[PDB]
Design a protein around this ligand. Structure first.
Ligand code: HEM
Lengths: 431, 55
């Protein structure tokens, strides 16, 4: 297992695996939804569905290729997959359809049909997908009036004002050679890829991207979307967390692993070594929860999400969870830290060593764009093993004890108390 | 009076009654707070308060 970075004008990164049976080749750009403004929000999500449109997918399918695309807050990628003997055809398809010609894809008949399909997807997301849209509303209230607040899909109000000239204006500012990384994963050797690119003279455009002026900033706030005709309540809560390239990046992920995830209907999930589960199962305070530690280029979020049918005891669920977060400053034990070390290593090993080269192409390109290289899994395991109890207590005294929070919620949330009752539970008046 | 005018038995029985009636008042205040717990308080607009409550 080894990565190889090489620059000749174009940054080329590979990750060779001679045991895999497919190969994957694409390009990742270093702009996401946090490089848009409130008037062209959704222009990245439209460029994805233009690339995945029917006439473009049909040209690829006669060659034997498949297409993927992903939109995030800091990056976006466009990936072609094939059998290991036809990576030259997949690199040709990325040259013709995406680099040279774009007036074929941006015809008026293709643009209006794609815009209709995207507007239906965003409408069905806002009406049916309740856990993921509460987490989207948590980002917009915590980073309000700041580039990290814009949703990755766009809104229905901002998507209908978009024309063809808005997509060409975004492509001239961000789809550049100094913003791009060419990636290759699966069964493909590194020097075979750099000689196929150098046998041509690929270059997107010369110049740099615009520089935004407002930096990300956390603000303690809340947003409530009450809907009494829904059968549950869905709540997210977080503090300000760690960015990428932070010295406390792995300590924050281990602290979330201490409290973990839960499913009340799976019998083995009920037997986990988490002390919070004693209070919750006595009166059945929720159906599921999960803790997270998200990281971006400038900021991050640390907290949990939950879903509940017990709508008269919502205040007991928030109170018991926040009293366990107080113990990370005061009285976290050594056996809880050793359990979280083994489970964080199992979770990280499953994320980076799945058998999908499309997942590996997204992870490799996003990390080379920020850091310039990639940290191996062997070196990440040695940083996790060196964390002590005193590292956890010093991190939680800075980020958790007596700090501001952000709350989002939907459904039957009448039993959720107001902000200052929840804010005062971030300290004990004992220590 | 305990007699024919305001005199010594009148003042002695008035002090003993004065000790007792504040304890009857304290029991009526408890019955007053029980009836208030059933319906809650009103508000200066005169209309229902069930839509927006704070603890
Ligand atoms: C020692 C005497 C008393 C005590 C300790 C007491 C106590 C209270 C308290 C704590 C409340 C709730 C808060 C408030 O609305 O101010 C209340 C409400 C109320 N009290 Fe009293 N009270 C006393 C005497 C009286 C008297 C003399 C009356 C009327 C003749 C009265 C009639 C009411 C009413 C109608 C309410 C409801 C007000 C509303 O909901 O808008 N109380 N009382």
């Amino acid at each position: 297992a080894e990565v190889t970075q090489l620059s000749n004008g174009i940054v080329v990164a590979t990750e060779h695996n001679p045991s895999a049976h497919t190969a994957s080749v694409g390009v990742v750009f270093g702009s996401g939804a946090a490089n848009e403004n409130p008037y062209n929000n959704g222009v990245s999500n439209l460029w994805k569905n233009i690339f995945l449109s029917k006439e473009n997918s049909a040209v690829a399918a006669k060659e034997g290729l498949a297409l993927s695309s992903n939109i995030s807050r800091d990056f976006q990628s466009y990936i072609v997959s094939s059998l290991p003997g036809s990576t030259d055809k997949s690199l040709d398809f990325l040259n013709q359809s995406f680099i040279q010609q774009k007036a074929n894809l941006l015809s008026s008949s293709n643009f209006e049909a794609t815009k209709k399909s995207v507007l239906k997807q965003v409408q069905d997301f806002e009406e049916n997908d309740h856990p993921n849209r509460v987490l989207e509303h948590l980002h917009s209230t915590a980073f309000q009036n700041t580039p990290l607040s814009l949703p990755t899909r766009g809104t229905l109000e901002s998507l209908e004002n978009l024309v063809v000239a808005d997509l060409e204006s975004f492509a001239n500012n961000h789809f550049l050679n100094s913003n791009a990384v060419v990636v290759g994963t699966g069964n493909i050797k590194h020097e075979d890829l750099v000689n196929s690119i150098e046998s041509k003279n690929l270059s997107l455009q010369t110049g740099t991207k615009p520089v935004l002026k407002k930096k990300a900033a956390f603000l303690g706030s809340e947003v409530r979307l009450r809907d009494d005709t829904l059968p549950k309540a869905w709540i997210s809560l977080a503090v300000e967390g760690e960015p990428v390239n932070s010295p406390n990046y792995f300590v924050a992920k281990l602290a979330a692993q201490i409290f973990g995830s839960y499913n009340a209907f799976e019998p083995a999930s009920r037997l986990q070594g988490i002390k919070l589960l004693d209070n919750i199962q006595e009166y059945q305070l929720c159906d599921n929860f999960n803790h997270f530690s998200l990281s971006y280029k400038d900021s991050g979020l640390w907290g949990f999400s939950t879903a509940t049918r017990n709508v008269t005891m919502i205040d007991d669920l928030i109170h018991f969870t926040l009293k366990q977060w107080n113990r990370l400053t005061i009285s976290v034990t050594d056996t809880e830290v050793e359990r979280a070390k083994s489970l964080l290593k199992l979770q990280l090993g499953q994320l980076y060593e799945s058998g999908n080269p499309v997942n590996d192409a997204n992870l490799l390109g996003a990390e080379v764009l920020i850091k310039g290289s990639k940290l191996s899994l062997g070196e990440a395991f040695k940083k996790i093993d060196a964390i002590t109890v005193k590292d956890v207590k010093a991190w939680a005294g800075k980020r958790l004890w007596d700090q501001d929070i952000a709350i989002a919620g939907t459904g039957q949330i009448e039993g959720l108390l107001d902000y200052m009752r929840i804010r005062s539970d971030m300290s004990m008046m004992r220590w | 009076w305990g007699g024919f005018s305001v005199s010594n038995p009148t003042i002695q029985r008035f002090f003993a009654l004065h000790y007792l009636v504040p304890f009857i008042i304290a029991a009526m205040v408890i019955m007053h707070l029980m009836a208030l717990h059933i319906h809650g308080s009103s508000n200066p607009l005169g209309i229902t308060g069930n839509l927006d409550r704070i603890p």
